[PDB]
Design an enzyme around this catalytic site. Structure first.
Site, PDB file in Angstrom:
ATOM      1  N   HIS A 169      47.521 -41.752  -0.210  1.00  4.70           N
ATOM      2  CA  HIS A 169      47.063 -42.933  -1.118  1.00  4.70           C
ATOM      3  C   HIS A 169      48.228 -43.600  -1.098  1.00  4.70           C
ATOM      4  CE1 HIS A 169      49.150 -39.932  -3.687  1.00  4.70           C
ATOM      5  NE2 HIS A 169      49.624 -40.986  -4.108  1.00  4.70           N
ATOM      6  N   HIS A 178      51.649 -42.211   0.398  1.00  6.64           N
ATOM      7  CA  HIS A 178      52.018 -40.583   0.040  1.00  6.64           C
ATOM      8  C   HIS A 178      50.907 -39.876   0.673  1.00  6.64           C
ATOM      9  CE1 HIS A 178      54.309 -41.990  -4.040  1.00  6.64           C
ATOM     10  NE2 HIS A 178      55.305 -41.921  -2.636  1.00  6.64           N
ATOM     11  N   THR A 200      51.847 -39.415 -10.927  1.00  3.84           N
ATOM     12  CA  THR A 200      50.496 -39.880 -11.710  1.00  3.84           C
ATOM     13  C   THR A 200      50.426 -38.315 -12.633  1.00  3.84           C
ATOM     14  OG1 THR A 200      49.044 -39.313 -10.233  1.00  3.84           O
ATOM     15  CG2 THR A 200      49.611 -41.328 -10.451  1.00  3.84           C
ATOM     16  N   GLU A 203      57.366 -46.721  -5.286  1.00  4.77           N
ATOM     17  CA  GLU A 203      57.681 -46.004  -6.511  1.00  4.77           C
ATOM     18  C   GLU A 203      59.325 -45.503  -6.214  1.00  4.77           C
ATOM     19  OE1 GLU A 203      54.737 -42.874  -6.773  1.00  4.77           O
ATOM     20  OE2 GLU A 203      54.057 -44.210  -8.486  1.00  4.77           O
ATOM     21  N   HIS A 206      42.826 -45.560 -10.511  1.00  8.03           N
ATOM     22  CA  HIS A 206      44.158 -46.280 -10.301  1.00  8.03           C
ATOM     23  C   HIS A 206      44.686 -46.295  -8.964  1.00  8.03           C
ATOM     24  CE1 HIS A 206      45.766 -42.127  -9.054  1.00  8.03           C
ATOM     25  NE2 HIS A 206      44.828 -41.521  -9.636  1.00  8.03           N
TER      26      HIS A 206
HETATM   27 ZN   LIG Z   1      51.546 -41.286  -5.036  1.00  9.84          ZN
END
Ligand SMILES: [Zn+2]
Length: 258
Positions: free
Chosen positions: A92, A117, A197, A104, A62
């Protein structure tokens, strides 16, 4: 048929396998800058990355993740809203198919091209696996990316991506200094939230920096050449791996600055 970012398994589907998706402290959220309260108790964020030891970079299907040796107190986040010491384990990104989306968190509904992040776990819980089961187990430092000038400190990451194009591929990635990914100011917003996630655990103190870093169009374009799929499978470009803003519910976002 596991979770992903496709048309049939994306964020709107996740609640079926992970019911906490509709929980009371889910992330990300929109940061309403005019409603966030300046908090005169918020200490300066302490980021100590001088001894950070990167090990490896992995395409996890992902996103890609740069992992660190977290077996000693080497790269730690403390201060700010945090009690105690949190150790860096990986970083990531989340990014879009276009520069107009990808982050996000949003700021007054504004979407950035991407979001970094840096994930840290509370040392009082001994390791990452135990930490994510606790309400104060993680501190994630979130940094927005906008497209403009190149970020020199990111280039070593961009150049290794060709070697981990598909899901499951990893590569030695030592001596990478995450200090090269930080903006000038450490002014931040903070609120209690979750992993973005699955398993979406409600274990994160979010610290989102107000100042974005600039990366070049060429840099983000190379993110978009990655694949969600494994080698030998039909090609699906790794783009739009961002979860949209979730309801704030019973939460207040605090600002370290006025
Ligand atoms: Zn993240």
């Amino acid at each position: 048929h596991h979770w992903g970012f496709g048309k049939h398994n994306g964020p709107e589907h996740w609640h079926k396998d992970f019911p906490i998706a509709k929980g009371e402290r889910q992330s990300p959220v929109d940061i309403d800058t005019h409603t966030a309260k300046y908090d005169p108790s918020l200490k300066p964020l302490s980021v100590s990355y001088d001894q950070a030891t990167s090990l490896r970079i992995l395409n996890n299907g992902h996103a890609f993740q740069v992992e660190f040796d977290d077996s000693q107190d080497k790269a730690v986040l403390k201060g700010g809203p945090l009690d105690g010491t949190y150790r860096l384990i990986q970083f990531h990104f989340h990014w879009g198919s276009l520069d107009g989306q990808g982050s996000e968190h949003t700021v007054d509904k504004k979407k950035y091209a991407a979001e970094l992040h840096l994930v840290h776990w509370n040392t009082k819980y001994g390791d990452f696996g135990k930490a994510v089961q606790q309400p104060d187990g993680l501190a994630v430092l979130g940094i927005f990316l906008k497209v403009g000038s190149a970020k020199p400190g990111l280039q070593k990451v961009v150049d290794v991506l060709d070697s981990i194009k598909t899901k499951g591929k990893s590569a030695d990635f030592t001596n990478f200094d995450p200090r090269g990914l930080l903006p000038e100011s450490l002014d931040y917003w903070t609120y209690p939230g979750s992993l973005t996630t699955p398993p979406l655990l409600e274990c994160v103190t979010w610290i989102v920096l107000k100042e974005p870093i600039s990366v070049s169009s060429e840099q983000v374009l190379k993110f978009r050449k990655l694949n969600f799929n494994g080698e030998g499978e039909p090609e699906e470009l790794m783009v739009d791996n961002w979860r949209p803003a979730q309801p704030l519910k019973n939460r207040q976002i605090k600002a370290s600055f006025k």
